[PDB]
Amino acid sequence: IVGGYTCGANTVPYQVSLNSGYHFCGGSLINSQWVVSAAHCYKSGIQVRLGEDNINVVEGNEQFISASKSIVHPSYNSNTLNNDIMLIKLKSAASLNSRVASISLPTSCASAGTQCLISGWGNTKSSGTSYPDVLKCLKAPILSDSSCKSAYPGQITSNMFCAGYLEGGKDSCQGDSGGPVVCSGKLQGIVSWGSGCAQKNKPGVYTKVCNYVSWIKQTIASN
Numbered sequence: 001i002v003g004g005y006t007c008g009a010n011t012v013p014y015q016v017s018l019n020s021g022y023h024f025c026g027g028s029l030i031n032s033q034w035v036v037s038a039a040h041c042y043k044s045g046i047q048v049r050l051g052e053d054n055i056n057v058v059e060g061n062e063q064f065i066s067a068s069k070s071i072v073h074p075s076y077n078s079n080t081l082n083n084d085i086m087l088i089k090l091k092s093a094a095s096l097n098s099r100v101a102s103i104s105l106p107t108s109c110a111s112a113g114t115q116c117l118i119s120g121w122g123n124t125k126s127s128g129t130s131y132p133d134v135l136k137c138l139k140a141p142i143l144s145d146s147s148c149k150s151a152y153p154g155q156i157t158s159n160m161f162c163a164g165y166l167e168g169g170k171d172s173c174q175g176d177s178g179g180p181v182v183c184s185g186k187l188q189g190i191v192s193w194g195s196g197c198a199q200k201n202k203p204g205v206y207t208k209v210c211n212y213v214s215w216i217k218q219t220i221a222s223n
């Protein structure tokens with residue numbers, strides 16, 4: 001997260017860290033046994049880390065649970081990042097509490113100007129590499145489709161939206177991928193892609209979760 005603030009330990013209880021010996025992506029807990037992340041975060045050997053604040057210190061409230069299966073959207077395209085969403089099933093059910101809790105899926109899409117919360121342990125610098133120990137937060141609005149498409153002509157599908165600041169300085173970045181975009185208590189996006197981080201006229205691009213609710217529900221019920 002570039003231009004953000006320290007969230008505060010466990011203030012974002014649905015945030016997860018995907019770990020393979022190091023933090024490489026975020027995700028969101030959507031019930032006690034399933035996490036939603038980005039398809040481009042797929043790899044084998046994932047451990048899901050719940051209840052984290054400092055990702056380098058065991059502080060208490062952590063739960064570490066292996067992934068049993070990761071389900072990349074069958075129509076995910078690595079070239080265009082269309083349908084950049086993946087479901088992860090935990091080997092065992094998480095213990096839900098005030099520090100580890102699920103986030104609701106939306107029943108409708110959010111509109112332009114809606115203010116959302118974005119969170120992650122990604123790079124905090126637009127020039128250079130600076131990863132934080134603790135979780136960072138950013139409030140960002142959903143941009144209009146016209147502005148999104150003007151920023152990235154021909155690259156925006158109906159499964160993507162832009163959020164952020166055209167003046168630059170505030171954005172998600174490398175290591176935030178897969179993490180949540182939460183608006184009015186609902187998961188509306190997943191950190192997917194962008195052009196650099198926090199550069200002018202190049203906002204972040206996010207997977208539009210409201211387009212996938214029926215797919216998520218159908219897939220969880222059959223797995």
Ligand SMILES: CC[C@@H]1[C@@H]2[C@H](C(=O)N1Cc1ccc3c(c1)OCO3)[C@H](c1ccc(C(=N)N)cc1)N(C)C2(C)C
Nearest residue numbers: 040079080081171172173174192193194195196197204
């Ligand atoms: C595997 C995808 C990777 C991903 C993704 C990212 O941007 N990628 C490149 C990309 C750029 C434009 C595209 C595209 C892929 O497909 C269609 O158009 C990601 C990224 C995520 C968010 C932001 C940002 N908010 N500025 C910035 C970067 N990066 C840190 C990578 C991990 C390499």
Ligand SMILES: [Ca+2]
Nearest residue numbers: 054057058059
């Ligand atoms: Ca920790």
